[PDB]
Design a protein around this motif. Structure first.
Motif, PDB file in Angstrom:
ATOM      1  N   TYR A 157    -116.688 -10.247-115.106  1.00 50.55           N
ATOM      2  CA  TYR A 157    -115.972 -10.577-113.878  1.00 50.55           C
ATOM      3  C   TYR A 157    -114.531 -10.081-113.940  1.00 50.55           C
ATOM      4  O   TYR A 157    -114.107  -9.262-113.111  1.00 50.55           O
ATOM      5  CB  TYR A 157    -116.027 -12.101-113.667  1.00 50.55           C
ATOM      6  CG  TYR A 157    -115.166 -12.578-112.524  1.00 50.55           C
ATOM      7  CD1 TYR A 157    -115.351 -12.080-111.242  1.00 50.55           C
ATOM      8  CD2 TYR A 157    -114.160 -13.506-112.731  1.00 50.55           C
ATOM      9  CE1 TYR A 157    -114.546 -12.495-110.193  1.00 50.55           C
ATOM     10  CE2 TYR A 157    -113.359 -13.933-111.684  1.00 50.55           C
ATOM     11  CZ  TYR A 157    -113.560 -13.426-110.422  1.00 50.55           C
ATOM     12  OH  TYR A 157    -112.766 -13.850-109.382  1.00 50.55           O
ATOM     13  N   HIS A 217    -120.619 -12.228-111.652  1.00 55.11           N
ATOM     14  CA  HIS A 217    -120.207 -13.166-112.699  1.00 55.11           C
ATOM     15  C   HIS A 217    -120.870 -12.924-114.051  1.00 55.11           C
ATOM     16  O   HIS A 217    -120.402 -13.469-115.056  1.00 55.11           O
ATOM     17  CB  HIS A 217    -120.512 -14.608-112.290  1.00 55.11           C
ATOM     18  CG  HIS A 217    -119.576 -15.180-111.279  1.00 55.11           C
ATOM     19  ND1 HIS A 217    -119.996 -16.065-110.310  1.00 55.11           N
ATOM     20  CD2 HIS A 217    -118.244 -15.013-111.090  1.00 55.11           C
ATOM     21  CE1 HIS A 217    -118.961 -16.429-109.573  1.00 55.11           C
ATOM     22  NE2 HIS A 217    -117.887 -15.797-110.019  1.00 55.11           N
ATOM     23  N   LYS A 241    -121.904 -11.943-117.661  1.00 55.59           N
ATOM     24  CA  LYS A 241    -121.157 -11.562-118.863  1.00 55.59           C
ATOM     25  C   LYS A 241    -122.169 -11.052-119.882  1.00 55.59           C
ATOM     26  O   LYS A 241    -122.930 -11.839-120.467  1.00 55.59           O
ATOM     27  CB  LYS A 241    -120.356 -12.730-119.453  1.00 55.59           C
ATOM     28  CG  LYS A 241    -119.677 -13.666-118.448  1.00 55.59           C
ATOM     29  CD  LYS A 241    -118.613 -12.938-117.681  1.00 55.59           C
ATOM     30  CE  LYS A 241    -117.567 -13.934-117.108  1.00 55.59           C
ATOM     31  NZ  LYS A 241    -118.185 -14.862-116.125  1.00 55.59           N
ATOM     32  N   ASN A 244    -114.864 -14.105-119.988  1.00 48.89           N
ATOM     33  CA  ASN A 244    -114.206 -12.942-119.413  1.00 48.89           C
ATOM     34  C   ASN A 244    -113.590 -12.088-120.514  1.00 48.89           C
ATOM     35  O   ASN A 244    -113.379 -12.541-121.644  1.00 48.89           O
ATOM     36  CB  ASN A 244    -113.129 -13.380-118.418  1.00 48.89           C
ATOM     37  CG  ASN A 244    -113.736 -13.961-117.149  1.00 48.89           C
ATOM     38  OD1 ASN A 244    -114.165 -13.218-116.272  1.00 48.89           O
ATOM     39  ND2 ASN A 244    -113.821 -15.287-117.071  1.00 48.89           N
ATOM     40  N   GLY A 277    -106.409 -23.314-114.836  1.00 49.41           N
ATOM     41  CA  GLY A 277    -106.516 -22.050-114.128  1.00 49.41           C
ATOM     42  C   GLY A 277    -107.886 -21.406-114.211  1.00 49.41           C
ATOM     43  O   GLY A 277    -108.195 -20.528-113.395  1.00 49.41           O
ATOM     44  N   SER A 278    -108.715 -21.815-115.178  1.00 50.30           N
ATOM     45  CA  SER A 278    -110.090 -21.339-115.299  1.00 50.30           C
ATOM     46  C   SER A 278    -111.114 -22.422-114.990  1.00 50.30           C
ATOM     47  O   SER A 278    -112.286 -22.305-115.384  1.00 50.30           O
ATOM     48  CB  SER A 278    -110.339 -20.740-116.684  1.00 50.30           C
ATOM     49  OG  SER A 278    -109.382 -19.729-116.964  1.00 50.30           O
ATOM     50  N   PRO A 285    -111.880 -23.615-111.531  1.00 46.91           N
ATOM     51  CA  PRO A 285    -111.417 -23.432-110.134  1.00 46.91           C
ATOM     52  C   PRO A 285    -112.167 -24.291-109.121  1.00 46.91           C
ATOM     53  O   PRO A 285    -112.997 -23.824-108.336  1.00 46.91           O
ATOM     54  CB  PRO A 285    -111.638 -21.931-109.912  1.00 46.91           C
ATOM     55  CG  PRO A 285    -112.803 -21.606-110.767  1.00 46.91           C
ATOM     56  CD  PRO A 285    -112.744 -22.513-111.984  1.00 46.91           C
ATOM     57  N   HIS A 301    -115.548 -23.143-120.841  1.00 45.37           N
ATOM     58  CA  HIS A 301    -115.893 -22.100-119.894  1.00 45.37           C
ATOM     59  C   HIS A 301    -117.339 -21.669-120.068  1.00 45.37           C
ATOM     60  O   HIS A 301    -117.858 -20.893-119.251  1.00 45.37           O
ATOM     61  CB  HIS A 301    -114.917 -20.918-120.065  1.00 45.37           C
ATOM     62  CG  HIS A 301    -115.015 -19.879-118.997  1.00 45.37           C
ATOM     63  ND1 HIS A 301    -115.852 -18.783-119.098  1.00 45.37           N
ATOM     64  CD2 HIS A 301    -114.377 -19.758-117.810  1.00 45.37           C
ATOM     65  CE1 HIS A 301    -115.718 -18.032-118.020  1.00 45.37           C
ATOM     66  NE2 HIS A 301    -114.829 -18.598-117.222  1.00 45.37           N
ATOM     67  N   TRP A 342    -107.818 -27.712-109.178  1.00 45.02           N
ATOM     68  CA  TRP A 342    -106.808 -26.796-109.705  1.00 45.02           C
ATOM     69  C   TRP A 342    -105.640 -26.555-108.763  1.00 45.02           C
ATOM     70  O   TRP A 342    -104.569 -26.149-109.237  1.00 45.02           O
ATOM     71  CB  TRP A 342    -107.442 -25.455-110.096  1.00 45.02           C
ATOM     72  CG  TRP A 342    -107.924 -24.585-108.968  1.00 45.02           C
ATOM     73  CD1 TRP A 342    -108.273 -24.977-107.707  1.00 45.02           C
ATOM     74  CD2 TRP A 342    -108.115 -23.164-109.013  1.00 45.02           C
ATOM     75  NE1 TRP A 342    -108.668 -23.885-106.962  1.00 45.02           N
ATOM     76  CE2 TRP A 342    -108.580 -22.762-107.743  1.00 45.02           C
ATOM     77  CE3 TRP A 342    -107.937 -22.192-110.005  1.00 45.02           C
ATOM     78  CZ2 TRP A 342    -108.870 -21.429-107.441  1.00 45.02           C
ATOM     79  CZ3 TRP A 342    -108.224 -20.870-109.703  1.00 45.02           C
ATOM     80  CH2 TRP A 342    -108.686 -20.501-108.433  1.00 45.02           C
TER      81      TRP A 342
HETATM   82  O1  LIG Z   1    -117.247 -16.935-113.660  1.00 49.91           O
HETATM   83  C1  LIG Z   1    -116.064 -16.754-114.090  1.00 49.91           C
HETATM   84  O2  LIG Z   1    -115.883 -16.340-115.262  1.00 49.91           O
HETATM   85  C2  LIG Z   1    -114.864 -17.069-113.189  1.00 49.91           C
HETATM   86  C3  LIG Z   1    -114.962 -16.870-111.822  1.00 49.91           C
HETATM   87  N1  LIG Z   1    -113.976 -17.124-110.978  1.00 49.91           N
HETATM   88  C4  LIG Z   1    -112.809 -17.617-111.441  1.00 49.91           C
HETATM   89  C5  LIG Z   1    -111.763 -17.887-110.530  1.00 49.91           C
HETATM   90  C6  LIG Z   1    -111.924 -17.668-109.169  1.00 49.91           C
HETATM   91  C7  LIG Z   1    -112.606 -18.595-108.401  1.00 49.91           C
HETATM   92  C8  LIG Z   1    -112.769 -18.396-107.037  1.00 49.91           C
HETATM   93  C9  LIG Z   1    -112.239 -17.266-106.437  1.00 49.91           C
HETATM   94  O3  LIG Z   1    -112.405 -17.058-105.061  1.00 49.91           O
HETATM   95  S1  LIG Z   1    -111.380 -17.863-104.041  1.00 49.91           S
HETATM   96  O4  LIG Z   1    -111.373 -19.348-104.317  1.00 49.91           O
HETATM   97  O5  LIG Z   1    -111.903 -17.834-102.624  1.00 49.91           O
HETATM   98  F1  LIG Z   1    -109.897 -17.235-104.124  1.00 49.91           F
HETATM   99  C10 LIG Z   1    -111.552 -16.338-107.204  1.00 49.91           C
HETATM  100  C11 LIG Z   1    -111.390 -16.540-108.566  1.00 49.91           C
HETATM  101  C12 LIG Z   1    -110.559 -18.394-110.997  1.00 49.91           C
HETATM  102  C13 LIG Z   1    -110.375 -18.626-112.355  1.00 49.91           C
HETATM  103  C14 LIG Z   1    -111.401 -18.361-113.253  1.00 49.91           C
HETATM  104  C15 LIG Z   1    -112.627 -17.851-112.785  1.00 49.91           C
HETATM  105  C16 LIG Z   1    -113.667 -17.578-113.695  1.00 49.91           C
HETATM  106  O6  LIG Z   1    -113.507 -17.780-114.858  1.00 49.91           O
END
Ligand SMILES: O=C(O)c1c[nH]c2c(-c3ccc(OS(=O)(=O)F)cc3)cccc2c1=O
Length: 441
Positions: A43, A102, A104, A122, A292-293, A295, A327, A424
């Motif tokens: 991602y 998403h 990995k 990630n 921050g991770s 969300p 995570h 968050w």
């Molecule tokens: O699966 C993954 O590894 C991940 C997927 N997303 C993540 C986000 C995120 C979530 C929603 C989004 O979209 S938004 O809310 O509309 F702006 C944008 C980024 C933010 C932080 C970490 C992760 C993450 O670790």
């Protein structure tokens, strides 16, 4: 051990809790194979960081980055990779709104064979630093001799299933990797692949992906036991989607129904959801920035407060990781006293319809927005009727071939009355974190 399920290394825990964990530098080391080429499905990428994780002698070997970025985000990724002439990019098509790539996964082509790594991190420093993350390491798959005709298939159908997952991208760079996989013998594989790809699936294709794929595997390759209604379901995740106005809209109708399937014949089943509380995050190794991770938005959460009565704290004394925020995502089916499990899944899929699929068209179509990937451990694939739960994740059980390393504590602990789910995008200014800071988004 038969499972080859690992956690990432956590900076700051005692060495006892990292012996048998893997850093990305370990995975890419020459000890694992002599690299010819690799594909990195993910991602989020820090390309400068990523290339530094390869051994110096392998840093010029071809790398394919498989991502889902569009528009300005795609341009940023290309600009990151432009310094490195050996790096190619594959933009996975995302033709359904609000979908994300998403998955990995590493495909590691060696002089000696092929390895597949399916994991949860990630490709950025912080995801491998102080988080709880999960890794499945395939065996070293040997090449099938030129002129020899054999399938190279496993009893779990992993080879064809991985090719099928890659075919869904319809991408020329991944057809090359499909042809690599065809040339290798994957028959030792003892896990089942569970993928999600974007689309609307009807008829036979409905069982190919998402929670219907899980249901099909559990129907065909697990058996129901007496008192099965007493065996809980556990889901453990780092993000929550919009699940609807009550539990009957999706969570406890179709999602739980797939998760509780066992065997081919025809609900009181306890459902435990594990998601970090605010206090979990505040006292974590990273402090509030761990959030921050995680969300989970206030806009989504305020629409489904019913959900939080299912929530249990993160606790991982068994692996020394209670302060290493998760995570990893996992789903499993423990016995009523949590001493055994009927199956275990590690995956990229969070608790969302986008990741797992939502039924449409009067229950005849499964719609999935995202790419996700995980591997399912079933006792039948190991000659067993159930897995005994390993008491200490990094310990030496009397039977490692029957003893599954669950990375967090059982039974899960319900939130207290003063606990709240980590959200968050609201401030936390009442108590400082382990670095001395508040959280003001
Ligand atoms: O699966 C993954 O590894 C991940 C997927 N997303 C993540 C986000 C995120 C979530 C929603 C989004 O979209 S938004 O809310 O509309 F702006 C944008 C980024 C933010 C932080 C970490 C992760 C993450 O670790």
């Amino acid at each position: 051990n038969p499972f080859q399920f690992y956690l990432t290394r956590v900076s700051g825990v005692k060495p006892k809790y990292n012996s048998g964990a893997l850093h990305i530098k370990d995975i890419l080391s020459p000890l694992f194979g002599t690299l010819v080429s690799s594909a990195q499905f993910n991602y989020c990428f820090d390309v400068d960081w990523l290339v530094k994780q390869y051994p110096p002698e392998f840093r010029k070997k071809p790398i394919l980055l498989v991502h889902g970025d569009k528009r300005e985000a795609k341009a940023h990724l290309h600009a990151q990779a432009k310094p490195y002439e050996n790096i190619s990019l594959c933009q996975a098509k995302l033709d359904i709104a609000f979908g994300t790539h998403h998955t990995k996964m590493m495909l590691l082509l060696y002089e000696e064979g092929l390895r597949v790594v399916i994991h949860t991190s990630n490709l950025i420093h912080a995801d491998w630093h102080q988080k709880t993350q999960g890794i499945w390491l395939s065996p070293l798959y040997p090449r099938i001799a030129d002129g020899t005709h054999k399938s190279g298939e496993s009893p779990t159908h992993f080879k064809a299933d991985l090719i099928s997952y890659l075919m869904a991208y319809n991408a020329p760079s991944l057809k090359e990797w499909i042809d690599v996989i065809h040339k290798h013998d994957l028959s030792e594989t003892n896990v089942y692949l569970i993928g999600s790809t974007p689309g609307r699936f009807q008829g036979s294709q409905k069982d190919n992906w998402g929670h219907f794929r899980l249901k099909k595997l559990l129907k065909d390759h697990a058996s129901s036991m007496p008192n099965a209604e007493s065996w809980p379901v556990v889901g453990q995740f780092s993000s929550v989607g919009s699940l609807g106005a009550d539990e009957s809209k999706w969570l406890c109708s179709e999602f739980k129904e797939s998760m509780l399937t066992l065997g081919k014949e025809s609900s009181s089943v306890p459902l435990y959801l594990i998601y970090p509380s605010v206090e979990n995050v505040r006292t974590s190794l990273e402090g509030y920035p761990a959030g921050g991770s995680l969300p989970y938005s206030i806009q989504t959460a305020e629409k489904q407060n019913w959900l939080h009565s299912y929530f249990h704290k993160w606790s991982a004394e068994t692996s020394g990781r209670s302060n290493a925020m998760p995570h990893i995502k996992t789903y499993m089916r423990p016995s009523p006293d949590f001493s055994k499990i009927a199956w275990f899944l590690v995956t990229s899929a969070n608790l969302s319809k986008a990741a797992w699929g939502a039924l449409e068209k009067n229950g005849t179509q499964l719609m999935i927005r995202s790419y996700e990937l995980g591997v399912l451990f079933l006792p039948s694939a190991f000659g067993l009727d159930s897995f005994k739960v390993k008491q200490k994740f990094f310990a030496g059980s009397q039977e490692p071939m029957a003893t599954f390393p669950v990375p967090y504590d059982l039974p899960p602990e319900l939130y207290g009355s003063k606990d709240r789910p980590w959200i968050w995008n609201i401030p936390y200014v009442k108590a400082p974190d382990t670095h001395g800071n508040m959280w003001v988004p």
